[PDB]
Amino acid sequence: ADRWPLSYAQQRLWFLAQMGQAASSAYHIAGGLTLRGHLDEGALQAALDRIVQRHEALRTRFELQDGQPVQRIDAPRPFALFRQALGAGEAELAHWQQVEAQTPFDLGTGPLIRGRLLKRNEQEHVLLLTMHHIVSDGWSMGVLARELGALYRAYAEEKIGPEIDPLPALPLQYADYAVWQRRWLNGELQQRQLAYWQQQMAGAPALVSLPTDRPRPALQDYRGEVVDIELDAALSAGLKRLSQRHGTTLYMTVLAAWAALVARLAGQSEVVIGSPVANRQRAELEGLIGFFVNTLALRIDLGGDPSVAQLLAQVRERVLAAQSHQDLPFEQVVEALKPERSLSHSPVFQLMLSWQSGPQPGGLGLDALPAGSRRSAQFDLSLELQDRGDGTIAGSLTYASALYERETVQRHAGYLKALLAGMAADDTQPVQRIGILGEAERHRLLVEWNDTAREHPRTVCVHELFEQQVERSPEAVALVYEGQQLSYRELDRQANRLARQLKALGVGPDERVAVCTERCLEMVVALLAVLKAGGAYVPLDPGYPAERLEYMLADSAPKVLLRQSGQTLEPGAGVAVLALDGEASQPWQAQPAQRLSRDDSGVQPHHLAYVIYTSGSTGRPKGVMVEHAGVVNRLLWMQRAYGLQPQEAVLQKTPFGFDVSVWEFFWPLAVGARLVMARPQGQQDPAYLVETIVGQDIGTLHFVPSMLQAFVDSEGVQRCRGVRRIVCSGEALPGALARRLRQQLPQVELHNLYGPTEATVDVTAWACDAAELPDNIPIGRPVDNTTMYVLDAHGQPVPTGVAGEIHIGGVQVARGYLGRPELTRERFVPDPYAGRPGARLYKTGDLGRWLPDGTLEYLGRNDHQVKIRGLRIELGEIEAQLARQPGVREAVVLARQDRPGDPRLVAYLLAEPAAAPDAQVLRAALMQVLPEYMVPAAYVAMPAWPLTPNGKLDRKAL
Ligand SMILES: [Cl-]
Ligand SMILES: [Cl-]
Ligand SMILES: [Cl-]
Ligand SMILES: [Cl-]
Ligand SMILES: [Cl-]
Ligand SMILES: [Cl-]
């Protein structure tokens, strides 16, 4: 009664079996062989009987002893080979090998190895062989088939007596290996390898952030499908030559390839790829049939932007260092590491790469049988390659169906094949500069989704768009400011009168003119007069402190300051002050109202139209110099896409220091509509906006998302039934706010626009016309004559769904920053995708990605990125889940970076009038919908949001 102990891997399967969790097909080692030719059924029986005679693991039962399990061994016995028939057909054979992989074993009585001899013809059989994983592994099937083929060829063809064993005796058995392991796990060598893996995996990314077609569920879906993958002869020989030159194996070279590709796609510097390893280092163990295989986590780093040779050198050492510590079980590694085991994904790694040797290179043709169609997706992606004897490298890429689509995985293999080709071609280049996109996807990202060319007039300025409209519609109303009105002709006369006094002074092409005034009729007269005079207008909002105005006034270095009456702003010497209204304005109001000749101004579309300064969030304000031709294209597109009618009205409600006011001014003036100048900000009642919309019948309106929220919640918002369009710019628009505007005002058409001040005004637009609106409202498709690109660190287009830096190109890119050329050269780079002489490209610093439908998605700034566990976090997904909770009206989540290198998530709430929210109610209910690392630590309530001068949400005031 000899009772031997279990190995660590066997005790885990026994513990899982007692709980009823070792019932999967992954715990059965199934194989098959097709036997073409006449079959000596007596010799095949003698071969199977000798295998169980040799390997006492195939005679092993499992039972209890003093509470703990033991490894009982029986005496040799004949093999349980079941004979049956088999009809020809791919489906009939796939059924019986599915039964072999599905049917459970009896660990108490056995046997733990079985087979089926499926007879097809009198000279063709299919031998299926299946054994439990507590007794075998993948290497064991190779030993079983190799040992079976030699025993049959000796008993059948050589006529060796079944009495004797024609193969060499085993030096030891699996029970000997278990006794050695139990003594090893209690010694210092186990402490060394556990100490190595903690240090090696310290700070590694817990979860990969590969872009998936669907979000990953709370409970992992183990269902999976497969995508074939094959490398042709030229690539395989090039990879074998590359591996020989750098001292790596084909496994190491593919590992460096996949880890480099996943780094680009997931937006992470480090990638952790799992891999099985045959724990058969002792040469005596290579011929045994036992549970030996172990898992190794390989941590690859690409933060240094390495070359091909430097990445291969890294993977070489990290694999050899991992293989020199493979004795430690992987379950003790995941237990010794910090990250918590989640039900949504696998621990430590979510991607696995595996390699295996080729087929075995007679009378009976023992050809191998391929695996079944079904594959259990134990991880997100599983790459399993082999070196075939014909000179190619082929395998299968198994993907979890709940995460990816079949089309997405086919592109993933295409990236890897193209990446491997670049590594074999040139080993000196940086591995992340290698091209991976196919010709179809590259042409779709660069050309098809940038097909925005339009033949607009390019020899016209913004003031000429107005001069062409006053001749078509002179007697129609153009400006409305508190009862007073001005026709298109009277406005053109007032602008021409002021333009002559500016032209009498030193105003000309590219000269600046500062305009300091609150909203009135003279504000639009000043702007048109500056453009007519040939210069560019610099808006100076008097609501800002005098310190800011005196800086923008000195930095712009204008020729004239157009100042309102009650304004104490004073400029420096050299520049002339000129009154805009009041008694001090009669010098220019007495000018002839005749229009200035085009050759007198000398203005051109390539000259400056305005210089609007930035808010100064990351330094002092910068003057963005925008030319005439860019504003014309921006205005002509807005009319082409929305079609403003001459009878409609537009409300000038955005501060004219905000470049959104540009189209609020000149779009209705270039088409024929009337512009209602709203009352100045400091003189407005909370109910002023609602009564001004219905009082003046405003057609087109603009809001920033945080201001649109106050408009929806204002008193009497449903009275604004005459509104046709609402445009959103500045912030990101939540889907919950868009769906609430859909109910309050069903007739209005909401549009989402994106664009920095350096790209004229806006460059992309998206209509909220879908019946189903997403939580993340896309910024849309580019506008006319402007291209959009999502580039990586090397300025190259990233694949679809991959995050990168948004780059803007076309005619709307600004000339640069006034008086700061070095910053312009850094963020106004040449455009290589245009094919034009000196076309430029603006670096926005905004993170974004292309969606499969050809639209762009805003992902925030690069400096405002939040990461937990080395994984990017979308704070909008947390704010949206808070708003769904009862008792909460609005929510904002921020990342307060304390002393630890792991920021604290603080949530800010606007409560519903019913009651104030409770922290435990929000904590528990949100703990179920979101993971543990996305639940805020503290929740605070506020009466209202603090706002910026432009109406945006002031997150720094929170
Ligand atoms: Cl370290
Ligand atoms: Cl390990
Ligand atoms: Cl494609
Ligand atoms: Cl903006
Ligand atoms: Cl918000
Ligand atoms: Cl804090």
Side-chain angles (χ1 to χ4, degrees), residues 476-679:
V477 52
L479 290 180
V480 174
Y481 174 71
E482 301 275 31
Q484 297 293 281
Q485 294 183 359
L486 278 181
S487 65
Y488 268 85
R489 180 64 64 182
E490 292 170 324
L491 173 57
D492 199 74
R493 281 195 271 258
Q494 276 287 84
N496 290 335
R497 286 194 249 263
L498 181 56
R500 291 193 171 275
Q501 195 77 54
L502 298 174
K503 200 62 178 181
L505 302 165
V507 177
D510 288 1
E511 297 291 338
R512 280 74 57 186
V513 176
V515 179
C516 178
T517 173
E518 291 192 348
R519 272 192 295 270
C520 57
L521 293 176
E522 289 80 341
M523 167 181 288
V524 182
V525 177
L527 267 41
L528 290 169
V530 171
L531 303 168
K532 286 163 172 292
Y537 79 88
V538 180
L540 303 186
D541 190 354
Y544 285 82
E547 293 68 89
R548 174 66 60 84
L549 299 182
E550 293 172 11
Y551 162 72
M552 297 185 296
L553 188 50
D555 186 76
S556 62
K559 271 288 181 60
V560 178
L561 163 63
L562 296 175
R563 181 165 107 233
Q564 209 178 11
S565 295
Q567 293 295 335
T568 62
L569 180 60
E570 197 72 34
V575 308
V577 62
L578 194 53
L580 207 55
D581 61 328
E583 191 80 337
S585 65
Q586 64 185 261
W588 70 264
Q589 298 230 46
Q591 287 273 6
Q594 41 175 319
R595 187 181 299 179
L596 288 172
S597 50
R598 178 63 190 276
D599 199 66
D600 194 307
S601 303
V603 73
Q604 305 292 344
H606 59 77
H607 288 149
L608 293 184
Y610 61 85
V611 180
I612 287 178
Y613 281 78
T614 60
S615 353
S617 178
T618 55
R620 68 184 189 273
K622 304 157 296 183
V624 181
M625 303 176 300
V626 179
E627 301 181 10
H628 272 274
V631 193
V632 172
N633 184 88
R634 169 64 173 88
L635 293 166
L636 291 183
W637 162 84
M638 206 167 189
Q639 170 71 5
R640 173 193 165 277
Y642 304 135
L644 189 55
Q645 296 296 311
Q647 71 270 4
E648 304 187 36
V650 181
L651 180 65
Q652 160 59 25
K653 79 178 238 62
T654 306
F656 78 139
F658 196 5
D659 77 322
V660 168
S661 70
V662 170
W663 68 262
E664 278 191 334
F665 286 139
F666 304 113
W667 180 28
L669 266 58
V671 175
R674 53 196 177 99
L675 175 57
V676 174
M677 301 293 294
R679 193 168 300 170

Side-chain angles (χ1 to χ4, degrees), residues 896-898 904 906 908 938:
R896 285 285 147 83
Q897 257 124 95
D898 298 335
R904 172 180 173 91
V906 183
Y908 299 76

